[PDB]
Amino acid sequence: KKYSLGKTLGTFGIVCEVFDIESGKRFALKKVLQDPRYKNRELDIMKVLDHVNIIKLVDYFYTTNKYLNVIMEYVPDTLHKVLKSFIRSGRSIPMNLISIYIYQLFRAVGFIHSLGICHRDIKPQNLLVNSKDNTLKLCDFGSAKKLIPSEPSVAYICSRFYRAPELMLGATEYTPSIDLWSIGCVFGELILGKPLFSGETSIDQLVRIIQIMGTPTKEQMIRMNPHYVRFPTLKAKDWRKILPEGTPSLAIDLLEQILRYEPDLRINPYEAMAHPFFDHLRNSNIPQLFNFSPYELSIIPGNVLNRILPK
Amino acid sequence: SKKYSLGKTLGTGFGIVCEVFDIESGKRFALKKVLQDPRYKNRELDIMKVLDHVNIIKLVDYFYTTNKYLNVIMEYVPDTLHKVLKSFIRSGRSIPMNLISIYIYQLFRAVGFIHSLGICHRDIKPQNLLVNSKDNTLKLCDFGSAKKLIPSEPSVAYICSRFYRAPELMLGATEYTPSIDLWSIGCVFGELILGKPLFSGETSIDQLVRIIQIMGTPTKEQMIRMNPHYVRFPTLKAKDWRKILPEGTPSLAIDLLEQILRYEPDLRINPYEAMAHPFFDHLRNSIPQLFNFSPYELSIIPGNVLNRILPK
Ligand SMILES: O=C1N=c2ccccc2=C1c1[nH]c2ccccc2c1NOCC[C@H](O)CO
Ligand SMILES: O=C1N=c2ccccc2=C1c1[nH]c2ccccc2c1NOCC[C@H](O)CO
Numbered sequence: 001k002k003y004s005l006g007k008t009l010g011t012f013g014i015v016c017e018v019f020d021i022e023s024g025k026r027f028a029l030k031k032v033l034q035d036p037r038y039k040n041r042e043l044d045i046m047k048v049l050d051h052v053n054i055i056k057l058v059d060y061f062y063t064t065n066k067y068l069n070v071i072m073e074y075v076p077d078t079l080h081k082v083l084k085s086f087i088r089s090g091r092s093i094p095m096n097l098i099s100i101y102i103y104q105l106f107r108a109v110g111f112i113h114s115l116g117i118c119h120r121d122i123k124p125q126n127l128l129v130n131s132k133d134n135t136l137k138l139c140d141f142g143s144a145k146k147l148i149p150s151e152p153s154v155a156y157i158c159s160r161f162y163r164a165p166e167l168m169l170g171a172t173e174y175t176p177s178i179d180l181w182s183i184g185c186v187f188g189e190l191i192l193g194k195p196l197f198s199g200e201t202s203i204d205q206l207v208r209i210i211q212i213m214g215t216p217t218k219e220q221m222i223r224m225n226p227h228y229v230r231f232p233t234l235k236a237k238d239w240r241k242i243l244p245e246g247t248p249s250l251a252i253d254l255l256e257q258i259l260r261y262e263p264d265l266r267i268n269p270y271e272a273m274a275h276p277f278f279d280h281l282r283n284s285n286i287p288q289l290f291n292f293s294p295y296e297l298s299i300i301p302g303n304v305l306n307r308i309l310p311k
Numbered sequence: 312s313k314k315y316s317l318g319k320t321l322g323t324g325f326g327i328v329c330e331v332f333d334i335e336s337g338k339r340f341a342l343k344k345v346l347q348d349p350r351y352k353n354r355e356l357d358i359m360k361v362l363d364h365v366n367i368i369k370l371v372d373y374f375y376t377t378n379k380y381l382n383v384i385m386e387y388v389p390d391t392l393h394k395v396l397k398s399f400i401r402s403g404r405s406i407p408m409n410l411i412s413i414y415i416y417q418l419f420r421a422v423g424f425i426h427s428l429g430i431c432h433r434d435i436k437p438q439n440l441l442v443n444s445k446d447n448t449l450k451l452c453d454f455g456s457a458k459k460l461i462p463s464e465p466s467v468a469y470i471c472s473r474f475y476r477a478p479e480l481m482l483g484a485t486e487y488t489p490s491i492d493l494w495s496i497g498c499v500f501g502e503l504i505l506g507k508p509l510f511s512g513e514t515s516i517d518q519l520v521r522i523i524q525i526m527g528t529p530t531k532e533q534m535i536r537m538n539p540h541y542v543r544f545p546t547l548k549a550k551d552w553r554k555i556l557p558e559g560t561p562s563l564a565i566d567l568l569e570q571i572l573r574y575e576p577d578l579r580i581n582p583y584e585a586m587a588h589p590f591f592d593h594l595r596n597s598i599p600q601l602f603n604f605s606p607y608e609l610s611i612i613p614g615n616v617l618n619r620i621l622p623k
Contacts, residue, residue: 002352036375039314047372059360062349062375 497571
């Protein structure tokens with residue numbers, strides 16, 4: 001009764017736009033089929049995400065088959081729709097804007113990773129954008145999990161475009177580092193205007209990665225998955241020959257630092273925020289970039305913080 | 312339900328209140344379990360959800376269970392002002408005025424916060440006032456009797472309780488205001504000083520007479536302000552608190568009490584102005600957090616008032 005129903009946004013349930021009958025405000029409703037016997041993992045993660053670049057939990061309740069109704073913060077557009085529109089119009093997303101989106105993405109992921117939480121399905125359909133601010137917010141934690149580093153996961157993550165290579169190799173001991181590969185993939189697509197690594201199967205997807213970044217060495221295979229083994233030998237290619245003809249060197253340098261085979265070697269989110277590619281954001285439309293919460297300040301290293309911040 | 316382990320009982324008041332433990336983090340919380348239909352809203356949860364303040368008990372978690380029950384997990388504080396009050400009497404000592412001021416200051420800050428939202432507690436009493444001994448932090452809990460007052464709509468006069476109701480409630484008022492909480496604070500302040508409650512009595516008349524016997528018969532203008540729908544008592548002159556309260560009592564204590572226990576609901580000192588009252592000049596001159604105002608708090612405290620509240 002408290003929420004009047006709006007447009008369906010996407011379909012174990014459905015996602016709608018709803019309105020608070022009392023305040024007038026607009027929120028997002030996720031209605032999922034659910035037994036009040038068991039916990040809901042997604043609700044349980046939501047409950048802990050209090051960050052400016054992450055979608056906030058507002059309310060939740062049960063209904064009538066029994067359903068859990070999660071009411072969340074709303075943002076009016078997805079990076080998927082923005083990206084498709086630029087292609088449609090015939091032009092490239094300005095690099096200045098790409099940097100704005102990608103910085104905020106890094107900030108979000110930095111925050112969930114300081115809690116051991118991994119998203120596992122970062123994609124442009126999951127990156128909410130505000131046209132008026134250029135604010136970006138990470139949503140949908142239906143596929144997320146708190147990784148317990150002393151404990152093995154089962155390899156059951158299948159998806160196009162954005163999986164880390166270690167997931168394609170059936171890794172059992174993957175880490176939140178997987179998200180960092182996704183960011184890289186999003187970042188590249190934004191630049192190129194189409195995804196980096198297509199393919200319907202894991203083999204297909206692996207081959208495409210190899211085709212661009214070269215065959216992984218043995219040391220690289222172990223570090224991705226020590227439980228797994230031979231491909232043909234292909235040399236790495238230069239991103240400057242893959243990406244479109246205008247692409248800034250700083251953009252490619254950061255990209256090189258993200259898309260590494262060795263999960264442990266991928267750039268740290270706060271490190272990436274301190275990367276010269278964001279130097280023009282530090283030199284003062286722009287949303288909030290430097291309003292760190294007292295939690296974030298407790299977590300960012302002092303060397304790093306000083307390089308992230310403006311003079 | 313597995314997430315929390317029981318759980319010493321804290322009070323069976325439509326449900327129970329227990330101590331519970333987060334089996335993942337090890338932290339201790341308070342569980343309020345109430346009999347509830349998931350067909351209706353629960354008013355108390357809806358209020359909890361909006362209370363974000365250092366001197367009010369925070370909501371933590373909530374879930375359903377099986378007769379169907381709503382389970383409210385809240386911030387926990389290990390003691391009540393009632394137990395503290397009731398222990399000082401045992402030892403044959405009075406609560407230091409310096410301590411009394413610590414608690415009552417925080418109480419005002421809490422009330423200041425809920426009234427900025429139109430939320431009225433409606434049952435403030437030392438049993439509802441949680442105190443932590445490490446720190447002298449006080450927190451206001453248990454909003455099961457709270458309501459958001461919609462100034463343009465009447466309420467129904469069905470509030471019956473001992474010691475702490477505003478005179479307007481005793482008079483069957485239908486248009487009462489969050490001011491009723493300030494009357495309760497005054498009473499609590501008073502009781503802390505005196506060693507026993509100010510206004511005893513099992514019925515409404517009984518409660519009114521006691522007030523009238525200390526504060527004097529209300530004038531006609533004071534009756535209209537408490538309840539313009541209500542008519543004679545015998546004429547009694549006000550007594551002077553200096554002769555009711557114990558021999559030592561500081562004059563600023565009484566000054567502050569006088570400014571809370573007015574018959575005219577609209578004249579009762581407002582909470583921020585009370586923190587500015589000189590009775591708290593020693594906390595300023597000189598103990599928990601007192602001056603760490605939230606961005607929200609800062610935006611609704613008036614300018615001149617704020618400066619009087621803060622230390623120099
Ligand atoms: O604002 C949103 N908050 C959410 C929380 C969880 C899941 C989705 C959203 C939100 C969406 N905002 C949008 C604005 C324009 C278009 C779509 C959306 C949102 N959701 O997208 C549908 C979910 C789909 O199944 C995968 O993301
Ligand atoms: O810490 C508490 N949080 C609460 C939220 C709602 C209702 C009660 C409490 C809490 C109590 N903490 C205590 C510590 C010692 C003794 C009692 C309590 C709490 N409540 O006990 C029942 C409330 C009753 O109104 C007063 O006895």
